[PDB]
Design an enzyme around this catalytic site. Sequence first.
Site, PDB file in Angstrom:
ATOM      1  CG  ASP A 191      -2.133   0.903   1.068  1.00 30.48           C
ATOM      2  OD1 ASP A 191      -2.434   1.292  -0.092  1.00 30.48           O
ATOM      3  OD2 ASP A 191      -2.824   1.176   2.071  1.00 30.48           O
ATOM      4  CG  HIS A 329      -9.426  -0.686  -4.052  1.00 27.13           C
ATOM      5  ND1 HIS A 329     -10.464   0.059  -3.537  1.00 27.13           N
ATOM      6  CD2 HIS A 329      -8.313  -0.253  -3.422  1.00 27.13           C
ATOM      7  CE1 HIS A 329     -10.001   0.893  -2.626  1.00 27.13           C
ATOM      8  NE2 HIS A 329      -8.699   0.717  -2.535  1.00 27.13           N
TER       9      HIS A 329
HETATM   10  C1  HEM Z   1      -9.341  -1.618   4.247  1.00 23.79           C
HETATM   11  C2  HEM Z   1      -9.401  -0.593   3.420  1.00 23.79           C
HETATM   12  C3  HEM Z   1      -8.571  -0.380   2.197  1.00 23.79           C
HETATM   13  C4  HEM Z   1      -7.583  -1.155   1.650  1.00 23.79           C
HETATM   14  C5  HEM Z   1      -7.097  -2.483   2.172  1.00 23.79           C
HETATM   15  C6  HEM Z   1      -7.118  -0.483   0.475  1.00 23.79           C
HETATM   16  C7  HEM Z   1      -6.096  -0.991  -0.357  1.00 23.79           C
HETATM   17  C8  HEM Z   1      -5.530  -0.327  -1.406  1.00 23.79           C
HETATM   18  C9  HEM Z   1      -4.437  -0.817  -2.174  1.00 23.79           C
HETATM   19  C10 HEM Z   1      -3.744  -2.167  -1.959  1.00 23.79           C
HETATM   20  C11 HEM Z   1      -4.132   0.111  -3.107  1.00 23.79           C
HETATM   21  C12 HEM Z   1      -3.071  -0.050  -4.163  1.00 23.79           C
HETATM   22  C13 HEM Z   1      -1.662   0.380  -3.753  1.00 23.79           C
HETATM   23  C14 HEM Z   1      -1.571   1.871  -3.767  1.00 23.79           C
HETATM   24  O1  HEM Z   1      -1.676   2.496  -4.819  1.00 23.79           O
HETATM   25  O2  HEM Z   1      -1.415   2.502  -2.705  1.00 23.79           O
HETATM   26  C15 HEM Z   1      -5.043   1.194  -2.896  1.00 23.79           C
HETATM   27  C16 HEM Z   1      -5.099   2.340  -3.666  1.00 23.79           C
HETATM   28  C17 HEM Z   1      -6.081   3.298  -3.483  1.00 23.79           C
HETATM   29  N1  HEM Z   1      -7.126   3.272  -2.629  1.00 23.79           N
HETATM   30 FE1  HEM Z   1      -7.450   2.008  -1.242  1.00 23.79          FE
HETATM   31  N2  HEM Z   1      -7.826   0.633   0.298  1.00 23.79           N
HETATM   32  C18 HEM Z   1      -8.674   0.819   1.313  1.00 23.79           C
HETATM   33  C19 HEM Z   1      -9.591   1.853   1.521  1.00 23.79           C
HETATM   34  C20 HEM Z   1      -9.748   2.948   0.661  1.00 23.79           C
HETATM   35  C21 HEM Z   1     -10.694   3.991   0.778  1.00 23.79           C
HETATM   36  C22 HEM Z   1     -11.711   4.133   1.889  1.00 23.79           C
HETATM   37  C23 HEM Z   1     -10.488   4.870  -0.297  1.00 23.79           C
HETATM   38  C24 HEM Z   1     -11.261   6.063  -0.705  1.00 23.79           C
HETATM   39  C25 HEM Z   1     -12.529   6.282  -0.354  1.00 23.79           C
HETATM   40  C26 HEM Z   1      -9.421   4.319  -1.068  1.00 23.79           C
HETATM   41  C27 HEM Z   1      -8.906   4.882  -2.185  1.00 23.79           C
HETATM   42  C28 HEM Z   1      -7.782   4.429  -2.834  1.00 23.79           C
HETATM   43  C29 HEM Z   1      -7.181   5.226  -3.938  1.00 23.79           C
HETATM   44  C30 HEM Z   1      -7.614   6.586  -4.535  1.00 23.79           C
HETATM   45  C31 HEM Z   1      -6.132   4.495  -4.325  1.00 23.79           C
HETATM   46  C32 HEM Z   1      -5.201   4.900  -5.409  1.00 23.79           C
HETATM   47  C33 HEM Z   1      -5.712   4.583  -6.795  1.00 23.79           C
HETATM   48  C34 HEM Z   1      -4.567   4.851  -7.756  1.00 23.79           C
HETATM   49  O3  HEM Z   1      -4.062   6.029  -7.807  1.00 23.79           O
HETATM   50  O4  HEM Z   1      -4.132   3.879  -8.453  1.00 23.79           O
HETATM   51  N3  HEM Z   1      -9.040   3.133  -0.505  1.00 23.79           N
HETATM   52  N4  HEM Z   1      -5.941   0.861  -1.897  1.00 23.79           N
END
Ligand code: HEM
Length: 484
Positions: A191, A329
């Site tokens: 992450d 996601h």
């Molecule tokens: C248990 C909760 C969550 C997990 C396990 C999770 C996991 C991840 C992972 C593995 C990534 C890809 C690695 C990275 O780019 O950092 C990511 C990207 C992202 N997540 Fe989450 N996430 C969670 C909650 C959220 C929430 C609540 C939001 C927004 C409402 C969110 C928005 C994003 C965004 C905007 C990205 C980047 C997309 C990109 O620029 O490629 N996530 N998340």
Amino acid sequence: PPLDLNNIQGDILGGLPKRTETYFFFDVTNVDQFKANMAHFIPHIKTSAGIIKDREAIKEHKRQKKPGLVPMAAVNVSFSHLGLQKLGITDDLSDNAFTTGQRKDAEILGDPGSKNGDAFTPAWEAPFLKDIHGVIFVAGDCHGSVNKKLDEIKHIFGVGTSHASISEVTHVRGDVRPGDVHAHEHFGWLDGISNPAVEQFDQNPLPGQDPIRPGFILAKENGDSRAAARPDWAKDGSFLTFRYLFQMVPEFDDFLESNPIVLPGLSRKEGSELLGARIVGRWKSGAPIEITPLKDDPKLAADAQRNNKFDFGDSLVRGDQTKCPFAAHIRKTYPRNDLEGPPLKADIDNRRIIRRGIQFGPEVTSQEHHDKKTHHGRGLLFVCYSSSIDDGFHFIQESWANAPNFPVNAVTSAGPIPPLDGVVPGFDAIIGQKVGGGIRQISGTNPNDPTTNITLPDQDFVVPRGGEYFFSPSITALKTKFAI
Ligand code: HEM
């Protein structure tokens, strides 16, 4: 204009470096004594200048093989709408989510809860159902530093004594996971990879990291559409969304093991891994499936110069989910070309967020693994910043993640696209929530059979248990509006 980095709290642009971090949620009890104590507090606050300067001092200390020293844990501070009211700071900041407060807003986020008439109570831990006025957070290398720094802050506000200007509502602690997987969230994925680069801050954007204007992160800076509606003191503050998100890891692992993708060249194990990758949009390592659709590539994952250079091209217009599902996601939360390319050519810079998440809780135990059920609290302390929660976090959650027709409904709004006829991407499997806790489905996860849907277990993999919307003011705003 150039940004004044000594005026901007350091978690916003830069980010506070951390192996552990404590968020102290408080209420103001005596406003005048609170404002007088703030005069003493403000010099403790880490700014973005402070961050950059520290990072260089750490690099020289490290180049030089010295014995490796305590990063004096950095402090930041942030205020809810209820805290601004309490303090007499009544200028409108032009954001409905913030001003509504997340306890109410949570109904529309899709949190589990219940209704007395038209009054909604989310199913959160008891302290997050009280009025919170702000959060003081401290982040550093180890528990010793953080506690020592936090004890000092508590002396300044007189916490616990008869002469106290704040009281503790609750606190939460984040801790990076041990060892090789320290940057991985608890489901297992690396992450912190994709964040927006900010014009007039990020000097070397990484490939695939299009820089956005600073007013999409900082109020009243270049590109803040709401600049004219906002008061001068709001300049160089940012909205901090906090979400206390519990993760159900053994249930998620079990889910993957039960739904392996049957595909030429893959073990049963490998098909279960492919499903996880496809649901997230990356392999656990960090390798994006849009580059390497069918097997992980750890070297690509470890390389910041190649691991974020993709945009889904025109795969959405063509109806092609072979490399990446529409409902993955990362695609749900940053659409990239799905929206920035034809037909919409939409500007989604106001939908971008800077994430500063930290994990919490213990690893999964033998008993938990054997039961395939969760017995301990663990998950993610989710924190993000932008100049508009209405445009950023709230919208991402409601209109993209929770919206089973997104992104087809967005691109078909311009006119039907026959390769998308009848395509329903489904829910974001990670964070998507359905109001009432109903049945959620996700399509396109099998490369060979894009129309097959998986019905998600009733128990969501991620379960919110608290949160609030805060505003992180500038050093100069603190000094004039919150001090004496
Ligand atoms: C248990 C909760 C969550 C997990 C396990 C999770 C996991 C991840 C992972 C593995 C990534 C890809 C690695 C990275 O780019 O950092 C990511 C990207 C992202 N997540 Fe989450 N996430 C969670 C909650 C959220 C929430 C609540 C939001 C927004 C409402 C969110 C928005 C994003 C965004 C905007 C990205 C980047 C997309 C990109 O620029 O490629 N996530 N998340």
